[model samples]
Each structure stands twice: as C-alpha cells, then as structure tokens.
Target chain A: MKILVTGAAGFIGSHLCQALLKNSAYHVVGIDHFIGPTPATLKTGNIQSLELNSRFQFIREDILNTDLSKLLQDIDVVYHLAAIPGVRTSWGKDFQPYVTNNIMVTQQLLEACKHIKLDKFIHISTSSVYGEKSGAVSEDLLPIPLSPFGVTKLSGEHLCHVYHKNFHIPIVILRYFTVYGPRQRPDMAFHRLIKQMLEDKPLTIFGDGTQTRDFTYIDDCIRGTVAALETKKNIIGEVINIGGKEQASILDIISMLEKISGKSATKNFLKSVPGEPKQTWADISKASTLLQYSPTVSLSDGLEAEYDYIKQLY
Target chain B: MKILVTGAAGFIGSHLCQALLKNSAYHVVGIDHFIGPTPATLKTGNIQSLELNSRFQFIREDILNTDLSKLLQDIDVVYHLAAIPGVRTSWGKDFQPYVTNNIMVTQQLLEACKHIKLDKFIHISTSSVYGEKSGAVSEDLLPIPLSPFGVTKLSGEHLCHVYHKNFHIPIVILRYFTVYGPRQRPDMAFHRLIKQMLEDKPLTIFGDGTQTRDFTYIDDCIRGTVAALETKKNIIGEVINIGGKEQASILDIISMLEKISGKSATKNFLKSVPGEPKQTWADISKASTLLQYSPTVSLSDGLEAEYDYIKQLY
Candidate 1:
C-alpha cells in the first residue's frame, strides 16, 4: 500500500510515518510546511532514523500550494494531519493564518480528492470542537467551538463530510482528544510542564490547574489512525473519537511529572486565557466498535515518555 | 438610534432597513458589494424608496475591505447579514468567497466590535447549520452543516460567541429558517418557482418534492431582527432561532404557487444535489420567549406577495 501523510513532520504525524513504514509492503510519503514556532529539529530528527529506508519519501510542501492530485497518483490512503492547532493564540491578528492553513487548505485537498480514487481519506480533528461540555462528549453532540482555532478545525471536519457527501470521497474523520507523548509540540502543556519541572523552574499554571483533558498517548493515537485505514467495514462519512481511557487534571499531571522527573517545582498561577476549556472527556465507544481502538498508556507512562524526550531538547 | 446593516440591498437586509426606518429617530447606514448573480436591479429596486430619505445612507462596499471600525462610529447596533449564500454552488473553487465573505468578514467585524461600545451586534445566521434531522431542531441541538456554505455560516456564529466571551462584543445571533417573501433573492425556491410559473417555463425540482423546510416570512424575519436589537433582556452571546411557525414541503410550496399564480407548471425532477438537506424544521421556542417573536404571515399570503413582486422582475 502507498500512503500520504500531511503534517508528517509534527509529533503524531512523525510517529504515524514510522508505524506505517514498519510494513515491508508499505511505501510512506510525508509532507510538512513546518510553519509554527516548533524548531526544525523536532521534525527533521524524528524522521532521520527512517531516511535510510528506500520506501520512505519526504516533501516539504504547503498543502495549499502543492498539486495534491499529482501527489495522490498511486496513493491508496491519505492521512490529512496538516493544521495550525491550538486554542489560545488563535485570536486577533493571528487568526487569518489559521483560517488559511486549517480551513482553506482542507477544502483544497478535498477538492483535489474529487478526481482521485482513494481507499480512505482520514481527517484528524480535535476535541476542542465541543466547547466545554460537562460530561463525556460523543460524536452526536453539536459542536459549539469556543475559540477561533476550534471553529476552524470544526470547519475542516464539515468540509470533509460535505466533500464525501457530494463527491463520494472515501473519508473518515477522527476527533483526537488531547494527544501527548514524545516529540509533542513544545507549546503543549505536557512538554512545557515537564521541561519546567526538570529545570526546577516555576511552573506556570493557567486556570487554577484544575482543568482536565482526555490525554491519548502518541502510540494509541497512531494505532487508531492506522486502524481507520485498515478497517474492514466501510466507515466513510463517519466521525469517531479517539480518546484515552483516563482523564487527568492538569494538577494531577503536574504532580505525575514531578514524580517522573524527580524534581520539586514551584507553581505560578495565572488567569485562564479565552478559549481554554475547563475539562474534556471523550466517549470513544464508536471508535472501539468501529476501529477497535483501545488506548493503553496511563497518564504517568505518557508523561514519563514526554519528559524524557523534552529533557533532550534542553 | 444609528444602525449599520450589512448586505443592506438584499431581500432581508432591505426589508430590515425599511423596518428600522419606520422609527423616525433611526438613522440607517446600509452596506453591500452586490456580488451575487441577482442583477443590480433587485438590490436597487429593493432600496429605491429609501434613496429619497435623508436619514438612510447606502454605501456599495464589501465588508472585508471596508474599514469596519470607522463604520461603527456612533452606531448603536450592527446587523451583519452580508454573506455568499447557497448550498450547491458552495463547492470546489466557488467556496473561497464563502470563506472570505461569511467567515473572515465576520471575524473582522467582531474584532472591530471589540473596540466599540455597541448596544448589540446582531449576526444573521441560517438554519442550514443543522444538517438533515428529524423533529423540530432547537438551538441546543448539535449543528452539523452539510454544505460549505453552512459550515462557513456556522463559523461566523462561533466567532460571534467567542468575541462575546473574550471581549464582550455584545453579540446576538439569530438563525433564520428558509426565509421568503417579497424581494426574496431570485435564486431562492419561492422566487424561482413564481418566476417560472409566470414565464410559462418548466419548474426544476431537485430530488423528490417531499423535502420539507420551516419557511419564515420576510416580515416576521425582519420583526425578529428588530426585536433582537430592542429586547430588554441582555441577549449577548446567545443564539436564538428566528423561524416561522409553519412547516411546508417543496411539493406543498409548489402547489401553493400554482394556486396563487392560477397557472399549472411543468415539473422537471432532477437528482437531488448533495449538501441540500432532506428536511429542516426549526424550534423557535427560544426566540418566541426571549425576543417576543411571532410569525404572522401564512405561506399562501407570503407566496402571493412574492409572486406579485417577482412578476414585475420579468
């Protein structure tokens, strides 16, 4: 099988490429623009080990500018992971880039898929689409995004559904809930919190540090993504949540990080920024039934892996 | 009160401007780019009577390019109605404008509203945000827009909520359901059906004519818009449904048009285009309770009024 992965340089994307390359029959093609604040090393280094593999190919191209049809020549599956992800900074003057990268680029790719015959087109979505729901959120819930970033991501999901409805594009939308592990974005909570703890610096806590997230480990996230492609049942035009089994509060994770790094850290509490949700817990029943996805990593295990990798960056 | 109405030359916008002008104290500033296929005549004719009024000023400008903050000077309320609307046409390359006019322009306006102390920022939303569903859909139901147009409009709604959350922009969103009446857009069902009946041409029906819609009359829609601005309750950041009391199927509407026009029509049944919903029934209980909104015009009466105005267009 020949597969294409957009945003293949990022955390989950890089791991996904490695997993897909494990199959001797699979040829993996990766693409990324590396637009955000994350250093180039995270991307280049993540895939460096796979450079010797003859079946792996890398293209540093913007999805909006690249001729997607040409790239999809013999590609059987497309894992669309390219997006400007985050909630806080997706406001004011910075929103236009998110719109261009997240929404417009997704539409352009969906449009390109109209002429091609692909076995599967997997769109990676986020849990932020649901604005601060109290309990577990299923795919049936109406999404009221609290931030511009979530709104743009939700728009991308809608685009995927519409294109599938109109053009019969084989598509499956996976709403990933708070994925974390090694090679995580430097700006994500776990990475920053771990780095701060390791250096014995003051850890900045936003919103009282009580907020919880359904944190799926990188291996679990990649496993579910691959399963979406290899599933026997036709799950086209369906949205399923890929979330972790455990939900941990920021403070809980902070304490876990403190334990894993073996360092005491000072807390600096700050006002919560707009668009930050209080808590997020996903109902992964549909994913378990459809994709047979079962998350195995505990919070401590995921935090330790992330801490070990992030410590290297320092 | 000094008010600004985007898409002022439009069917609802023109009617809204007229309703506001009824109050002698109101100074209405209207804006429009006239980008749609609806000839310049419809817009010009809709607001032609307002041209002589000294208090009413119409500016032919695109919302994205205009300095919106400058327009907010002394403006008590802003009715953001400008957007590229349609379902089937909002696909492939044509979707770019919808993203710009509907999503980006709305963010631009909301961002500008942050600096101003406006009484209300009433955003015009559509029921298309809710995809095909059974039973009456209240504001609480999850909106899964089936088309790019719906997705962009939903994005606009999300923007309004976030702006109100972060900056207290005093936003109120009204989701109107299948609005139709005199001066309705030429592309809409009633307008097109009436014109075809008058011209002795065949009426094209996409899919089985059993598809239903919760049709709101123009007068009721305008009244709801006005009420959102005048409500005593603080409705900031709330989304209310401005839907009609009546539910009618496409076949029912076609039959009503035939009765009103006194002419039988040839029906051309075509394959239903994607992104067009099988049904849309709005639950307007929230609007009724909060804004004191009630629909008065019956479908037959509304169709007759539309038939009368559209006949002159030919």
Candidate 2:
C-alpha cells in the first residue's frame, strides 16, 4: 500500500514518513516545500539523512499546486499534513500567508482529492480550533476559534467534512493536541524552550507560565493516522482527539526541561499575543476506543528524546 | 460628513452616491472602472455626468491598486462595495477572479482601511455564505460555503471580523439577500431574464422554477445600507441581514417578469445547480429593529420600473 504524505519533510511529516516506510508493505511518498523552516522548527535534514529504501520517495512541491491526479493514481491513502504552521505568527500582515497557504491551499488540495479514489484522507487538525475552553476541552465542544490561524485551520476541517458528506470520499479528521517531538517546528513552545534550555539561554513566555497544554508525541500521532488509514470505513467523517494523557503547564514544562538539560533557564515574559489561547486540554476517549491508540511516552521520556535529538544539532 | 464609496460607478454605489450628494450635509466620493457593465444593472447611464457641487468628487482608480491611504485620510465613513461580483462563473478553473476580486481584493481594501481611523467599515456580505439553507437563515449559522466564490467571500467577512476584533476597528457586516433593480448587474438572473425576454429570446432556468428567494431592490438595498451607516454605532462587531421582506419563486418571478414586460418568455428548465440553496427566507427583524429597514418598493413596482428603465437600452 502506497501512502502519499503531504508536508513530508517537516517534523511530523518526516516522522510519519519514516513510520510508514519502515513497514515493507507500505511505500511512502513524502512532499514538503522546506520553506518557512526555522532554525529549530524543521528537522528535514534528519528526515533526509534516513537510509531511504526503494519503498520511500520524497518530492519537493507545494501540496497546493501538486499534480494530485498523477500523485494519487497509485496511492491508497493520503495524509494531508501540509499547512502554514504556527499560531503565534498568524496575525496582522503575517495572516496573508495563513489565509492563502493554510485556508486556500487546503481548499485546493481537498477540491482535488474529491475527484480521487483514496482509501482515506487523514486530515491532521489542531486543538486551537476548540479555542479557549473554560474547562477540559472535548471533541463535543463547539469550536469558536480565537485566532485567524485557528479559523483557517477549522475551515480546513470543515472542508474535509463537507467533502466526505457530499462526495462520500473516505476521510478521518484527527484533532491533535499540541504535538511535540524530535522534529518540532521552531516557533512551537517546547522546541523554543528546549533549545533555549539546552543553549543556556532565557526562554520567552508569552502569557502567564501557568498556561497548560495536552502535548502529544509525534509517534502516537503517526500510529493513530496509520490506523485510520487501515480502518477507513469506521472513521469517515469522525473527528477524534489524539492527545497525551498528561497536561503540562508552562512552569511545569520549564521545570522538566531544566531537569532534562541540567540548565537553570531564565524566563523572558512578554505581553500576551493575539490568537494565543490561555490553556488547552484534550479529551481523547474517542481516539483510544476507536483507533486502538494510546500515547505510551512519558513526559520526561518524550522531553529527553527531544532534548537528545536537538542537542546533537545545536 | 464625508463617506468614500468604493465601486462608486456601479449601480447601488451610484445610487448611494447620488443620494448622499443630494443631501447638503454629506460629501460623496465615487470610484468605478466600468470594466463590464451588466446588460442592465445600473440605473443611471453615466455616474460621471452627475452634477456635483464642491462636496463630491469621482476617482477612476481600481480599489486594488489605488492609493487608499491618500483617499481615506480624512474620510469619516467607508462603504466598501467594490468586488468582482457573481457566482455562476465562480466554479472549476475559472475561480481566480473570485479569489482576486472578491476575496483578496476585499482583504487588500480592509488592510488599507486598517491603517486609517474611520468611523466604520461597512462590508457587503452575501447570503450564499450560508451555502444551502432552506428555512429562515440567520447570521449565527455555521457558514458552510458551497461555491469557491462563497468560500472566498465568506473568508473576506471572517477577515473583517478578526481584524475588527483584534484592532478595535469598527466594522459592520451586511448580509444582502438577492439584490435586484434597474441597474442590477447584467449577469444576475433578473437582469439576464429581463434582457433575454426583451430581446424575444429564451429564458433559461438553472433549476426547477420552484427555487424561492428574498429579493431586495436596489433602492431598498441602498437605503438599508445608508441606515446601517447611520446606525453603525448601535451595531459593531455584529452581522445583520439586509434584505427585502418579499419572497418569490423563480417561476412566479418569471411570470411577474412576463406581466411587467408584456412579452412572452420562452422557458427552458435546466438541472439544479449544486451550490445554490433550494429556498432562501430572510429573518430581517434585527435589521428592522436596528436599522429601521423595510421593503419600500413592491416587487411588481420594482420589476416594472426595471423593465421600463432597461427596455430603452434594447
């Protein structure tokens, strides 16, 4: 089974590509632009360094403009992971990129996929769509996006649902909590914090350090995605939350990082940015029951893995 | 008070310009490219010919590339009516215009407006954003846009809402129902049907003639818009439906057209278009309470007036 993964060169995409290619039965085609990559965000190099066998193929193309007809001709599954990532920068003039790349680009891809015969189009969505929930956020909550970025991302999810309903195209939407791992994008919180702690520099905290997130590891994300591909019939038009059980606060996360890197990092508190949600916690009961998926990595283990992965490079 | 109107040379814009200019207290600045005049959408022949005292001036620059900073420097209010209007052509590969003219063009103008200190930025929205709702469509509905055109237009509205929410800008959204009048764009169903009937040609219907719409006349649309401008203080960060109370089916409207024109129209029924709503009924109670808006011109009166006005051209 050949699975085409968009945004393949990025952190999650690369890791997901690796997961699929390790299986001899799976031929994985990965695509990513490698543009907008930050010093800490993308580990495309690490992804490229892998000993890619005959089963794996990588292409550099914008998923928005790729020839999907030819690409999906032999593909059984499509993991649409390509997007203009980062919520912090999705404001003011920077929103142009988010509007075009995130909103319009996803529409172009979904519109193209409507004509294709794929096993499942696994759409990777963000938890930000749920916005700032007062309590523990769940899949059942009505998504009222607080950011322009969140609105566009939710627009992407909505497009996927409508296409599934109208065209009967197999689709599965996995609303991922804040995902962090080896290839975490530079702008993300943990990537910056971990890198700062490793470098013995100050980590900048936007809001109060008490803000929390249900951070899922990249490995669990791939397993859930691949499982959805295998069980498309049961997963169509369903939105499941894939999240790590532990919810870590900014202060708690910083302490963990300090423990892992053996560095007492300084903190630079800044004004709260627009589109920054106060706190996020996911309810992952549906994912656990349906996808047979559970996040196995502990917080320290995941942090250590990311720390080791980043320390070698920086 | 100075109100700078974009799409000033167009039908409703021209009427608004004339209305504002005629009033001693207001200064009206109009802009239009006259790129493609609808077969009979505009009420007046030449907006340029309107005799204006020192209070009125007309510029011919396209809003997209115009020096909006200079134009909007001292403006108190902005009526942003400029857009590449129409939905029939916003499909398949021919949607670039919708992206540019409708979506991006609106953003460009809003981006320009973001730099200015204006009393209000009144954005014109369409009911098409709700996609295909049958019952009384309200502003709070989750807008499931059906057409790429609708997607772009709604995206523009979302942009306005986010910008207003973030920057403390005053933006008033008006969701206009199907607008028709003597100067309605030639591409609109009413204008096209009238012109075709006047020329003794066949009137082609896109669906079974049972599709119902809440048609707002150009005069009522302009008056409602002006009312919205006046009541801008009462409603900020809110979207209101600006539509006539009149509801008529496509077939009934066609018969009304035949009666108004005193001409027989050869009917041709076509398969239903996917994106179009089967029926549209507006609950304009909010508009009535807030803007004091009500349909002044009866459909028959408006249709008769439009037929008389456009018949001369044929």
Candidate 3:
C-alpha cells in the first residue's frame, strides 16, 4: 500500500508521515510547500537527528500547480492536509493566500482526481468552519464561519461534496479540532502560549482567557484519521469529526501549562479577536460509531507532551 | 440620487440602467466589460433611441481591475448586476471563467467598498444556489448547489457577508429567479427556446422536460431589485429572494412559447445536465416583509410581452 500526505513537512504532516512509514509495507510520499512563519523550524538543519527511511519520499510543491495525476499514479490513499492553516493570520490583506490555498487548491486537486482511480481522498478540514459557537459541535450544524479563512476551508469541503456527487469520487472530510503536540505549527495558540510561558513572558489572552477548545494531541488525531481512512464503514462520501472530545478553557489550560513547566506567567490582556470562538467541543458520535475512532490522549498528558517538545527548542 | 449599475450592458443590466435613467434627477453610472457569450449587444444598444440624458455615463472595464472606490464616491446606490451569468454553460472546462468573473469580481468590489461609504449595495444573486429541491425555498436553507457556477456565485455571496460584517458596509442580496422578456441574454433557456421555435429549429431540453422553475419576468425582477435598493429597512446584511411566487414546468413553458410564436418546434431530448435543479420555487416571505416587494407580472402576460419584443428582432 502507498499513501500521499500533502502537508508532509509541517507539524501534523511530519508526524503523520513518520507514522505512515512505521509500516514497512507502506511507502509514504510527503509533499509540503513550506510557506509558513517559522521556515527555520521546518527545515532539516533545525531537527538534526535524521532517521532516513527508504519507504519515505518527500516532494515540496504547491498543491495548486502540482501534477496530482502523476503524484496519485501509484498512490492508494491521499491525505489532503495541505492548507493555509491559521485563523488569526487569515485576515485583512493576507486573505488572498488563504483563498488560493484553501479553496482553489482543493478544487485543482479534485479536478485532477476526476480521472484518477483513487481508494480514498481524506480532506483535512477544521472545526473553526462552524465558527464562534459554545458546547459540543456536530457535523450536521449549519456552517457559520466567523473568519474569512473558515469560509474558504468550508468552500473546499463543499467542493469535495460536489465532486463526490458528480463523479463517484470517495471523499472523507475530517474536521479536526485544535490539534497540538510534537511538530505542531508555530502559529497555533498552544505553541505561542507554551513558548511565552516557558520564557517567563506575559501570556496574552485574546479575550478574557475564557475561550475553550477540544485540543487533540497529534498522535491521537492521526490515529483517529487513519482509522477513518481504513474503516470499511459507509464513509465513502462522508464528513466526520476527528477531535479530542475533552474540552478545556484557556484559563484552565494556562494553569495546566504552569503546572507542567513550573512557571506562573503574567496575563497580558487584549481586546477579543473578532473571529475567535468562545468555545468548541466536537460531538464525535458519527466517527465513534462508524470508524470506532477515539482520542487516546488526555488534556494534561497532551499539553505536557507538547510542552516538553517545544521547551527543548525554545 | 445617483446609481452605479455594473454589467449595465447585458440583458437584465441594460433594462435596469434604462429604468434608472428614466428618472430625470437620477444620475446613472454604468459599467460593463461585455465578456460573456453574447458580445454583439453593446451597453448603449438597449438604450440607443432614448434622448441623451446628461445624467447617464458609461464606463467599459472589468470589475476586477477597475477603480471602484472612485466610481462609487458620490453614488448613493449601487446595483451590482455584473457576473458571468449562464447556468447551462457553467460546467466542465468553463468553470474558471465563472470563478474569475463571479467570485473574484465580487470580492474585488467588496474590498473596494471597504474604503467608501454607500447607502445601499444591491448584489444580484441567483436562485441557482438552491439546487434541485421541491417547495418554496427560504434564505436559511443550506445551499446544495447543483452547478459549479452556483458555487462560484454563492462564494461571492459569502464574500459579501464577510465585507458587510467587517466594514458594516450596507449590502442587500437579491436572488433573482429565471428572468425573461426583452433583451434577455440570448443564452438563457427562454431566449434560446423562443429563438429556436421561431426559426423552425429543434428545441433542446436538458431533462425529460419536467423540471419546474419559479420564473420571474424581467419587469417584475427590475421592480423587486429597485425595491430592494430603495428600502431603508436595515436589510443591508441579509440575502433575500426576489422571485415570482409562481412555478412553471418546462413542457408547459415550451407549449406557451409555441402558442405565442405560432411556430411548432421539434423536441430534442438530451441527457439531464448536472448541477441543474429539478425544480425551484422561492419563498419570498422575507422580501415581502422587508422591501414590501411584490411580483405582479403573470407568466402568460410576461411571455406575451416577451413574444412581442422578440418578434421585432426576426
């Protein structure tokens, strides 16, 4: 079996690639454009220890212009995770990149696959598409995107649905909740919060530090993701939520970080960000029933794991 | 009062421009790129014989690259009727043009409006967003667009909502039903059907001639559009449907066309086109309540009016 992972170099992508390569029979093809904030962190020089595996092959290219037919030729499954994946940075003049990467890129990939016979097309979507809601979020909710980026990503999911209907394309969309742990993107909230706290700097809260998220650990997230992909359930053209079912408030998370790192950080309060949701908790009823998918990592265990990884670098 | 009408040359656009210009005090600023299937119709062709109203000025430029802020400087009202408007041809390889014209252009205009002040921004939306479904469709329905063109247009609407939220820019969306009558774009179903019947050419139907549409006559459509523009009902941030609350099946419509033109037409049955709705009926309760909008043009009367208008061309 062979698999193509689009965001192969970044955080979840890198971890996902390594996990895929663990199976000797599976050849993992990784692709990443690496157009991100911390380019140094993503490069091989920063993460010096290399376990070069013959089964793992990496290609750096934008998904929009990538010859996906050639890429998908020997591939049995595609984990479409390549996206401009930050909600806070997806504002003002920076929106053009988000639109092109999130919406157009997905369409280009789908258009390429209309001719290619693929086993599965797993679309990496975000829970933010539901936008600024409290409590457990379900897949059936009317997507009310608070940010322009969320809207663009949802548009990608819409493209997936249309392509599936028009062509007999099998697409499985995973709306992953705030994912963290080793190799997490630097732009993500937890990364910043952890790094700032470790340095004894004032941790800035967007609102009153009450915003909560169902933060999934990287390993558990990939486990749920792979389970959904391999399951023989009726997920051929379905969208499932792959989230850490446990919900935690930002203030509670800050306390947890202090517990883990042995440092109490000062609060630097700012006006609430416009599109930031107050709370998010994913209802994984569908995925649990169909794929038997479950998140194995607890909030403290996951936060500690991420802190230990980032503390070594910062 | 001053008005800016984009796509002011095309079928519905020209009529809207002429209607606005008829008012002696109203200064009409019209713009058209003339970039669709029907290029023979110039912006001035529809309003040629009318006495040169010093109040009317026409600019020919693509909306994506134009200086919209300056154009909208003194304009109190704007009728944004400009878009790649054709449902039938919005498939396969032709989807790019629709994305550029409909989605990108709308975003550009909204981006431009973030710098200006306007009393009302009337965005011309289509009922195509509501795919094949039975009964009167409401605004809150999760749009399952049957066509790629519809997806592009809905993305435009999403752009409109984003601009409205971020800038508090006054925008009123009018989802016009299948508009017909004088100067209706030659590519539209009715226009093609009428012309084919008159010329003794076979008329083609995409389905089994059973698809029903809530046909809004050109006059009624323009009236509803103007109503949406003139109403100060705080509807700036809402998408409202403007359609004849009546429904008509394609077979009955063809019969009506034959009767009006006195021409018997042979039927050409083709495969059911994808992305097209099987039936469309608008729930105009929102428009009725907010704009005090009404659709007064009956189908038979409207068809008779269209028959007389098209007779001049042959």
Candidate 4:
C-alpha cells in the first residue's frame, strides 16, 4: 500500500507519516508548503527522523500550484491534512489564505483524485466545526462554525463529501477534537501552555478558564487514523469523530501541567478570544463502531511527553 | 437609508433593487460585475430600469477588488446576493470560481462591514446546503451540502455568522429556496423548462421528474428580503429560510408551465444531474417570526409570469 500525506511536516502529519512507514507493506510520500509562523527549525526537525527511511519521501510544494494529477498517479490512499489552522487569525482581510489553502486545496485534491482508484482519502477535520456547544456532539449535528477558520475547515469537509457523492472518490472524514502531545503546533492551547510554563512565564488563559475540549493524545489520534486506513468496513463517506474519552477544562489542564512539571505556574487571564469555542466534547461511538478505535493514553502521560519535548527545544 | 445590493442585476436581485427603490427611504447602490452567461441583454436590462431612478446608482466593480470599507461608509444596509450558483457546474476543476465568488467575496464583504454600523448585512444563501433530504427542513438542520456550489454558499453563511459573532456586523442570513418567476436565471430549472418550451423543444426531466423544490416567486423572495430589512426584531445572526409555502415536483411544475404557455410539452427523460437534490422543502417559521414574511404568489400565477418573460425574450 502507498500513502500520500499532505502537511507532512506538521504535528500530526509528521507523526502519521512516520507511523505509516512502520508497516513494511506501506510506502509513504509526505508533502507540505510549511507556510506558517511555526519556527523553521521546528518544521525541519519534525521530519528529520524520517529522512533516513528509504520508504519515505518528502515534497515541499504548494498543493494549489502543484500538479496534483501527476502527484496522485499510482498513489493508493491520501491523508489530506494540509490546511491553515487558526481561529483568531482568520478574520478581516486575513481570511483569503484560509479560503485558498483550506477550501480550495481540498477541492483541488479531490478533483485530482476523481479519475483515480484510491483505497481511501482520509480527510482530517476539527471539532470546531460544531462551534461552541454543550456535551458531546455527534457527526449528525449541524455545524455552526463560529470562526472563519472553522468555516473554511467545515467547507473542506463538505467538499470532500460533495466529491465523494459526485465522483465516487473513496473518502473518510475524521473530525479530531483537540489533539495534544509532542510536536503539537506551537500556537495551539497545550503547546503554548507547556512552552510558557517551561520558560518560567505565566500561562495566558484566553477565556474565563472554563473552556473545555475532548483532548486526544498524539499517539492515540495516530492509532485511530491508522484504523481508519486499515479498516475493511464500508466506511466511505462516513465522518467519524476521533477524540479521547476524557474531557478537560483549560484550568484543569493547567493544574495538571503544574503537577507534572513540578513548576508552580502563574496565570495571566485575558478576555475570551473570538472564534475560540468555549466547549468542545465529541461522541466517539461512531469511531469505535467503524474503526474499532479507542483512546488509551492518559492525559498526565501525554502532557509529560509534550513537556519534555518542549523543554529540549527551547 | 442607503442600501448596497451585490448581484443587483441577478434574477432576484433586479427585482429586489426595484422593490427597495419603491420606498423613498432607500437610496440604493446596486453592484454587479456581470460575470455569467445570463445573456448581456438580461444583465444590462436588469438595472437599466433602475438607472432612471434618482435614488439608485450602479457600480461596475467586482466585490473582490472593490474598496468595501469605503463603499460601506455611508451605506445603511447591504443585500449580498453576489454568488456563482450552480450544482453541476461547480464540480471537478471548475470549482475555483465558485470559491472565489461565493466564499472569498462573502468574507471580503463581511470584513468591510466589521467596523461599519450597518443596519443590516443580509447574507443570501440557498437551500442546497441541506443537500437532498425529506420533509420541510428548518434553519436548525445540519447542512450537508451535496455539491461544491452548496459548500461555497454554506461557507458564505458561516462567514456571515463569524463576522457577526466577532465584529458585531449586523448580519442576517437568508437561505432562499428555489426562486423563480421574472428574470429567472437561464440555467435554472423553471427558466430552462420555459425557454425549451418556447423554442418548442423537449422539457428535460432530470431524475424521473420527481425531484421537488419549495419554489418561491421573485416578488415573494424580494418581499421576504425587504421584511428581513424592515423588521424591528434583532435578527443580527439569525439564519432564516425564505421560501414559498407550497412544494411542487419538477413534473408538476412542467405541467403548470405547459398550461401557462398553452403549448404541448415534449418530455425529455434524461439521466439525473449530479449535485442535484431529490427533495427540498423549507420551514420558514423563523422568517415568519422575525421578518413576518409569507409567500403570497401562487405557483400557477408565478409560472405564467415567467412564461411571459421568456416569450418576450425570444
């Protein structure tokens, strides 16, 4: 089996590329434009380990400009995770990139794969599509995205679905809740929290500290994705939620980080960020039923792993 | 009050501009790039009547390039109907224009309105966002757009919401169902059917002619939009459905058109058009409560009006 993963140098993208290569039957190609505020060193370091593996190849090309048809030739599956992820920054005059990268790129990729016979095109989405909601939300829930980022991401998912219906492209959409651990994007909540604490700085709480998310560890999220690719079930066009069983508030996670780092962290509370959802919990029963996937890593262990990774980098 | 209506020379738009100008309170700025195949005569003619109105002015500018902030300065309200709407046309590689027009233009318009104290920014959407579903769907229904066109339109609605949530842009999203009658787009069903009948050609029966729609007359649609503007209710972020009360199948509509035209129609049973829905019916209770809107035009009368327009055009 051959796998193509976009955004291959990012947090989950790098991790997914590395994991897919573990199986001898799989040869993986990873691509990324690497266009973000994330440090260049971090982006390069993400795939440094994969450089030695002969089964892996990396392409640094924009999906929009690239010849997707030639790139998709002979590829068996595609993990389309290349999207500009940001809730706050996707406002005002700054939303064009989000529309281009998130919505346009997804459509282009799906269109390129229209004639090809692929095993599956795994479309990774976010829980933010459901916007600010109480309790665990299902895939069936109407997505009322609050941010431009959320709207763009949701549009990509819809594009995936539309292509699947029209073109018979093998597609499976995975709406991952908040995934945190080593190599998590520097701008994300957990990464910022851990990095700030390690630098002996106060953690910036965006909201009143009650905002919560269904936080999945990096390892578990990868496992579930692997399941999505490996499953024999008729899961095409199925949008499954990949999230952890446990939900944690921002303040609760901060307290846990303090205990894990043995560093008493000071809090810098601020007004809630716009496009930032107050609550996010997922119903993962569909994931379990479809892929036999489950989250196994404890949050404490996950936080500790991420903390160690950040400590070494800075 | 000064109103800005994008796509003001469109099917429903020209009617809306004329209706708005009827009230002396409205000074209208109707903008259009006139970028489609909707016949130059139709596009130019839509606003030619408005050119005589002292209160009405036309801007030959694309919303993408327009200095929206400056344009929005004195405008009291905006009717954003500028979108490339097509189901089958928005597939494969041709989906970019839909992204550019439907999604990006919408963001640009909303972003320009962020700081402006507009009375309303009426974001026009469609029922295709809900995809193909049974029964009369409400605004609460989760939108699973079946086509790229639907995906882009739905994204526009989401942008309106995010803008409203973050910047307090006075936005009102109206998801218009299948709008017909005078100046109906040449590509739409009713227009095509009427045009084909006028040419003495066979009427295209896509999907056994059973696909149904909750069709709204042009006058009624404009009325609902006017109501959206006139209502004292605080419908800042409300997504209300503007649709007719009656639901009719394609075959039924064809029959109505035949009777109105007093011509025998040849039935052309063709394969179903991809990206098309099997059923669409809207629950306009929200529009009723907020805008006090109701569909007054009968289907037979509406069909007769459209038949006369096509006859005159040919």
After the best TM-score superposition of candidate 4, give how far the Cα of residue B312 lies from its true spot, in angstroms: 1.8
lDDT of each: 0.88, 0.77, 0.80, 0.89
- Writing each residue's lDDT as its tens digit, candidate 1 over A40-109 gives 8777886686676799999988888888879888889999999988788887789999999999999998
DockQ of each: 0.68, 0.27, 0.45, 0.81
Q: Residues A1-314, candidate 3, lDDT per residue (tens digit)? A: 98888877777777777777778888888877777555655555322222388887777678766777788888888898888877777665677787777877787888888888889989999998887666677888777777777878877887887788877678999999999887677877788999898878899788898888888888888888888666878788777888884788889998898898888779898888766678888999998998898888898898988898888866
Q: Chain A TM-scores, all candidates?
A: 0.97, 0.94, 0.95, 0.98
lDDT of 3 at B76: 80
The candidate with the higher DockQ, 1 or 2, is 1
Ranking by DockQ: 4, 1, 3, 2
Clashing pairs in 2: A41-A185, A41-A186, B38-B186, B39-B186, B41-B183, B41-B184, B42-B183
How well is each residue in B47-133 modelled by candidate 2, as lDDT tens digits? 644544577788877676688778888888888777766666665566556666765666667767777888888888888777777
Tell how far residue A277 is off in model 1, in angstroms. 0.7
| DockQ of candidate 1 against the true complex | 0.68
What's the i-RMS of each model?
1.3, 2.9, 2.0, 1.1
Higher-scoring candidate on DockQ, 3 or 4: 4
The residue-by-residue lDDT of candidate 4 on A1-314, one tens digit each, is 87999999999999999899989999998999988657768999999999789999899999988888778989999999998887778877678898889988898898889889999999999998988788889998878899999999999999888888878999899999888889988999888999899889999998789888899999999999999999988999899999985788999999999899888989999988888888888899998899898899988889899989988888
Query: Candidate 4's error at A81, in angstroms?
Result: 1.1
Off by over 4 Å in 4: B232-234
Clashes of 2: 7
| DockQ class, candidate 2 | acceptable
lDDT of 2 at B303: 89
* Reference contacts reproduced by model 2: 0.09
Of 3 and 4, which scores higher on TM-score? 4
**CAPRI accuracy category, model 1:** medium
